[PDB]
């Protein structure tokens, strides 16, 4: 069956950036409901089960460009006082209703921490290898919820 609107699609993938494998895994997603980055959904459109291919997805069609406004300068106090607040460390801020917002520490100086709320892949072009494992129709429950049951990574 071919990948198309309102199909639940299972893929196995490898993700490389700048020639370094960053991720491998398997996931299922409901196609046509902005569940996957757009360049990848476009590359999967109309593919047959069993197809395997490689695809280059520019940042613009993946996680977007890096947004300079996602870089903030925050007090070193907001971090645990035995925390390793260091370039590359990840932390989660929380907003007024408790939503976790992940950040990566960029720099530290004095009482100030430069942090980046951008997605870690923002601004990066992604090279995928993708295999279409299974395609099926969605159930009414899945179409009503806009996602698959189960919805995400089998393996990551």
């Amino acid at each position: 069956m071919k990948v198309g609107q309102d199909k639940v699609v299972t893929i196995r993938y490898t993700l490389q950036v700048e020639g370094e494998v960053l991720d491998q895994g398997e996931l299922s997603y409901l196609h046509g409901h902005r569940n996957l980055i757009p360049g990848l959904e476009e590359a999967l459109e109309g593919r047959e089960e069993g197809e395997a291919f490689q695809a280059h997805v520019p940042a613009e069609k993946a996680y977007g460009p890096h947004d300079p406004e996602g870089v903030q300068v925050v007090p070193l106090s907001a971090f645990p006082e035995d925390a390793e607040v260091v370039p590359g460390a990840q932390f989660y801020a929380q907003d007024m209703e408790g939503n976790p917002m992940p950040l990566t520490v960029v720099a530290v100086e004095g009482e100030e921490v430069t942090v980046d709320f951008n997605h870690p892949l923002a601004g990066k072009d992604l090279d995928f290898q993708v295999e279409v494992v299974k395609v099926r129709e969605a159930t009414p429950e899945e179409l009503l919820h806009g996602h698959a049951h189960p919805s995400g990574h089998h393996h990551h």
Binding site: G25, N35, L36, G152
Partner: peptide
């Protein structure tokens, strides 16, 4: 942003 593969 929350869209997968989400590496």
């Amino acid at each position: 942003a929350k869209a997968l593969p989400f590496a």
